[PDB]
Amino acid sequence: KLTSWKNELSLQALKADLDAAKPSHTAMMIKVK
Amino acid sequence: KESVRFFDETGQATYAVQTGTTTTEVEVPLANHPTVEMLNPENIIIDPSCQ
Amino acid sequence: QEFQISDPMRKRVVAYEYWGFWDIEGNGVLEPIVATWIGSTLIRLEKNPYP
Amino acid sequence: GDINKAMFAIVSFETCKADLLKEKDRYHNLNKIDWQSSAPVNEPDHATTTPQEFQISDPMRKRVVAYEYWGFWDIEGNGVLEPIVATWIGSTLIRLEKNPYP
């Protein structure tokens, strides 16, 4: 739709990688806090 | 400037006489410069599997 | 938290950018892309413009 | 007490399918393996900083643990050792060749 690629991204797939790394990032910020 | 412009293109020494003009459509550059910012570590997430 | 601007043009919103490598083609090669979405709506999807 | 006289060495490292696809002919039988098993979650013998709960939905960018065997082997019945490199993932041999480095 937005691009001509035959493997165009989807919003859920992009957000799937977001919350996947969220626990690791959240734990790191605890020591930063 | 037009005379030397044509000289650069072809090498022919030609006089330039202003006879007319037209309203063209151009795009004036503005704020064309790089930027650097410091990100809050809480607002950025990196791949844990980066080793 | 209580601050806001009445003008819709100057409204403050939060945006997310996704920078990384994705297999944009079925051949099996990763390519650098940049994606931006606001409010669970995709608005930008293109390859990395930087050289 | 000498690395030069060592006859074999095994190193475990993480990789992805896209990383393996960088070489178009170095690996064989890549399709037979599954991307759910042999994960870092299922390999307690491999130490890593990757979180145990972390995973990637994309099969291309899936994280898997791979083993490399570097050493000298008597690849011929004559009785002379030769340097070889072997790689296997999930109890499946995918790479077997001599040492390419000069």
DSSP for chain C, written as a single string: -----S-STT-----EEEEEEE--STTS--EEEEEEESSS-EEEEEE----
Using a CB-CB distance cutoff of 8 angstroms, which residues of chain C are in contact with residue D61? 23, 30
What residues have CB less than 8 Å from C29, skipping those under 6 apart? C23, D18, D21
Residues 6 or more apart in contact with residue A29 via CB below 8 angstroms: B41, B42
State which amino acid sits at residue D56.
I
Residues C45 and A8: beta-carbon distance below 8 Å = yes
Query: Which of D11, D16, D49 would you mutate first to test chain B, the one with the most B CBs within 10 A?
Result: D49
Neighbours of D36 (CB within 10 A): 13
Residue B36 phi, psi dihedral angles, 5° rounding: -130, 135
Please give, rounded to a whole number of angstroms, the shortest distance from the CA of A1 to a CA of chain C: 10
| DSSP classification of residue B41 | G
Rounded distance between C-alpha atoms, residue A1 and residue D28, angstroms:
36
Contacts of B45 in chain D (CB under 8 A): none
Q: What is the resolution of this structure in A?
A: 3.7
Residues found in chain B: 51
8 Å CB contact of B48 and D50: yes
In chain B, which residues have their Cβ closer than 8 Å to the Cβ of A24?
48
Could you tell me if D90 and D79 are in contact, meaning their C-beta atoms sit under 8 angstroms apart? no
Q: Answer whether C34 touches A (CB < 8 Å).
A: no
For testing the chain B interface, which of A15, A22, A24, A31 should be mutated: the one with the most B CBs within 10 Å?
A24
3-state helix, strand, coil in chain B (%, to 5): 30, 0, 70
Give Cα separations from B39 to B43, B44, B45 (angstroms). 7, 7, 11
Locus of tokens 């065997």: D69
Q: Smallest CA–CA separation between A13 and chain D, in Å? A: 8
The β-bridge partners of D95 are D87
**Token digits for D59?**
């099969």
Residue type, B45: I
Asked whether B39 and B45 are in contact (CB, 8 A), the reply is no
How many Cβ atoms are within 10 Å of D87's Cβ, its own excluded?
A: 19
With contacts defined as CB-CB under 8 Å, which chain B residues touch A21?
45-48
List C-alpha distances in Å: D24 to C27, D1, D30, D58.
11, 38, 11, 20
Contact call for residues C18 and C39 (beta carbons, < 8 A): no
Substitution target from C29, C45, C46, C48 for chain A, most A beta carbons within 10 A = C45
Q: Which of A16, A23, A24 comes nearest D57 by C-beta?
A: A16
Please report which helix (H) or strand (E) contains residue D55, including its range.
none
Q: Say which experimental method was used.
A: cryo-EM
A/D interface, count of CB pairs below 8 Å: 16
- In the numeric block, the tokens 């202003």 are attached to B18
